[PDB]
Amino acid sequence: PKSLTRGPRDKPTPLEELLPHAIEFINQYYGSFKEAKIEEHLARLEAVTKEIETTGTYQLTLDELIFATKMAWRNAPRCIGRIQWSNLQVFDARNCSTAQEMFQHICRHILYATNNGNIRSAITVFPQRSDGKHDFRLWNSQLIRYAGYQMPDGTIRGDAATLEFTQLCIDLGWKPRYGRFDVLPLVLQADGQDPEVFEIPPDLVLEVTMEHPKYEWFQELGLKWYALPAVANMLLEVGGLEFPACPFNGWYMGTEIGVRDFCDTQRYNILEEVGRRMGLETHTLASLWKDRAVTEINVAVLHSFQKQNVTIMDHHTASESFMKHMQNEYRARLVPPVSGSITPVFHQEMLNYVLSPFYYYQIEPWKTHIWQ
Amino acid sequence: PKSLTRGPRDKPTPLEELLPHAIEFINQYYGSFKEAKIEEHLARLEAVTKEIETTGTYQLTLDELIFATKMAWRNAPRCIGRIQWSNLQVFDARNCSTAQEMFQHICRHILYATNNGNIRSAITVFPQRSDGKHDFRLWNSQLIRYAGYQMPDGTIRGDAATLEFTQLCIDLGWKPRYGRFDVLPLVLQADGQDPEVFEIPPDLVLEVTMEHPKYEWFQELGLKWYALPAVANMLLEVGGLEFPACPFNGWYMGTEIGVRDFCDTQRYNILEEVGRRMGLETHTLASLWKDRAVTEINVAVLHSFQKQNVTIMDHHTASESFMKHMQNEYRARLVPPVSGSITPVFHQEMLNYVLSPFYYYQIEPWKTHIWQ
Amino acid sequence: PKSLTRGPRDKPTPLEELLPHAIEFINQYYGSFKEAKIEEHLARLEAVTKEIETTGTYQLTLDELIFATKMAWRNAPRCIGRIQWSNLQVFDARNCSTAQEMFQHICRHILYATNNGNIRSAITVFPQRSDGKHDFRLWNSQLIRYAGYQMPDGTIRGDAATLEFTQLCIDLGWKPRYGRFDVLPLVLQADGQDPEVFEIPPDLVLEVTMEHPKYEWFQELGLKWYALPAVANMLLEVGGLEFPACPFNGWYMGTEIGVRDFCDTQRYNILEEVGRRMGLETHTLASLWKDRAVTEINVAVLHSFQKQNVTIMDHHTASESFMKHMQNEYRARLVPPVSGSITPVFHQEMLNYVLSPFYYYQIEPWKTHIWQ
Ligand code: HEM
């Protein structure tokens, strides 16, 4: 995915690589207004140019930043959320200094975002990359996520996708409770310093208890998942600027909540216990009972969410949320095309088209971090 | 060409894969108007969202469809016709039910389109893809096209490009007349059912008799070609919707009418008979007589078309047709850029740019069709 | 770089390959005006269509050409100059006939562009490609550039990048002075004829003498470079038209002026002589003295330029030049997006996106030229 990965630097972005993008951005920004702000637009371009001339970089106005985060969301071709991009709360943390402070900002986010199940979308933007030596990073892939443990006999326990990170956490001093649903700690890096680990206050992590509307025994097999899907390891590019730390969140779809993960020895087990029900024939592969169980688990999940009043992207939600997004544009008194975000970028030997602003992937920090 | 091929499905398009595209389309549509229709635009987006919420899909207004077919034409980078996209007649057949009915619609098209040589561009849109199990398809590559037969000794007779399809037709019960210009039958598939074959009424197929302005013996070698170039196997994508059956037509260019196909034992023969003329030396390859003959055949073709008053895209035609297209826009009282059609699509692992609406290729039906 | 290379032809561009592009261009052009020129726009499209119909090609109005050169500059993703695209002087030489005349036009350019160090950006556009058999070409890569000689013992003398071209010049009758800073002659090709070589009048080539602000011995090692960076071998594509000869110029950045070219036996030598200074230890690779010297050479260069008052793209220059570019747009009483230049081009088997107008690379002429 190297195309969509924006890596680390060790020196500020050159003028010839910053100025053009800053200009394009500011034009894009001022081009959004129904009512033009000519005098302001020209003076801003001047301000920014002189600022890059004198300081070597530039700062975004809170309003420019807000716009950037929303546009980058609008420019996320995989995200169904891009549909209602105006429904985003932006938390400005560009004045942050330490991991201690990062944690507070992160807790505020979780708190705001969770809202007792009535999930709200938000993004916390930490200081932008300066020289690439003083980066702010969240080593975690997601704010909330279960630990994955490599058991002696070879089987995994917990989230199989977090094995490498869990190990890291252990190496960093985190005491592993060898359970199936252990919420991983936040590994926060501020000002390029070594990362610091913080346990996430249990009260802040809302979890959905799995139960089926028909099968009363469902709750007996003790399955649960966290309500907040928040990405922590991405980078926001905007007008040449780079924000290595800017975690955001949305809400689940329903059809994807991963553990029903039809994979290995993790899958098989939960799937057989199920057969206890209606299609009790788990002794043979003649009855494709697995199809029955999977379909039913999705039912238990969907049901669990709606009954525990935790927002999920069902058909009604998708439409209602989109309407709310349209109400915001109407009260403002046509949209700026997606085309207005495509920038021709000539990287080594090929003319390619890139979107900006945009949420890029990054290289896992421990792979590049230089220990103090 | 897998990039430009939109294949078969076996389940409706997911919400997260439909809604964004529907929205983008409706925005694109309402963005065309010189005079904005704010109240209507917002209510339409609402209507469609609620419709996808409740029905799982949506229907286009005839006017939206018309717009879609024209824009998709405008988005056909190979088609010189894209120059005058407003000159298109749209035949709505989204209410069609059987192959019997398809045939009637198809005959109407040919009739309208042929217009005794005064070729007119048209497109017949059949029902959109629902679950991918009830598809409408024209198994033919073109509405009108000559059969290709594999003779015992190995030589081919007729159109070499239609060998596989001709065989299919034979397998489907069509009696092969082993001639050089046998018009293939229409293999129509409706509502996902098995295809039904219909012979095309000879009166509907206009053919141009080949003759040279100077060589009176030209007509003696009995060469002819059909006047109507119509593609039958493409798919129209629009706002997430897919129309597997939507044949369209234009008119010939003159320089391409394929049989002068410098290929094998099919070519060589017609080319030698020619040498009977001005450069009678067909005993040696010292006189590049082939160049002489080819140039002359193109002359006979071009001449044949203009004398038999069958529209062909010559220099005058190109300009006149473009003017007619400009007269339509002027009477309406600036154009919406092509950029407004490019949509960033994140398919597996790569950020690519796609045009929409657009005419995609498809997989030959007999290769995927499940027999009843 | 074959993607970005527009090669030679031997027959005019076909209608189906010209008309669409001409139309798109003219639309793009008339779409720039703050004040629409409806009557003029429509009549122009008509004019051009009829012109291509009758003549087989079309001529651009000087104003359309000016626009084309500026937009193509705006569409040069590597060029920091694209920032101030309105600051361009266009020299129309589409009426040029001979190499003699080309030379005069080229001398005027150098003269205007050099302006005693106060560098000004300009472009000289020679006759457009007709049938591809009567091309105007500058065989040189740059208007001004030092010769590169392959010495007997194997070492190179001068610009290592110009070895093949220098040889060509020698073959063409140019007497090689075997120095380090010999300005190469102009190899001009007009109307598809054989190229003619012209020595560039020394008075026209402004050179910067290298000296350090602190080290008085710097001037002693006699280093110099030319002030004018001008590309001579590119092709401008616009509305389907192709201009094989259209040299342009800008000014240096400072950080790139190549000879500090850390390469072979050319590098090493100048680098050691340096060590004579502050870090005199050139006997060992324990002291990374090379880093010291390189940094210092860049200092001598930058200093040499500013003291000899030869324009260079430093931070102040970048901002000041951009302001000058904004003053031009303000006095005209929002910009047309970059997206409005992207054209979907279906070349063999793939749907790609191209920019237009644009400055393409070309195949080195001597590799394709047919001698008379
Ligand atoms: C409003 C609720 C939201 C929903 C339902 C939603 C849903 C999704 C889904 C389903 C995916 C793609 C598939 C997957 O990774 O599971 C995704 C990806 C993404 N979303 Fe969201 N999203 C929401 C909010 C957000 C917000 C608020 C932002 C940013 C401000 C955002 C940015 C992205 C990005 C950048 C991706 C790419 C993920 C990747 O490929 O690694 N999303 N979103």
Ligand code: HEM
């Ligand atoms: C008005 C007369 C028309 C002319 C002269 C014309 C001409 C052409 C030509 C010369 C090609 C490309 C080369 C070839 O395949 O032979 C082509 C391709 C195409 N045309 Fe047309 N066309 C016309 C009308 C139409 C119409 C009415 C539509 C659609 C509404 C259309 C859609 C397309 C598409 C989608 C292709 C792609 C064919 C492929 O690559 O398989 N054309 N057209």
Ligand code: HEM
């Ligand atoms: C105003 C001063 C200018 C500056 C500082 C400037 C600077 C540059 C730089 C730094 C590069 C890329 C890296 C390199 O090749 O060294 C470049 C490339 C380029 N510039 Fe300029 N440029 C200027 C003016 C122009 C003008 C006037 C035009 C055209 C009208 C232009 C067209 C291009 C093109 C087409 C390239 C691509 C070169 C290649 O990749 O081979 N530039 N310019």
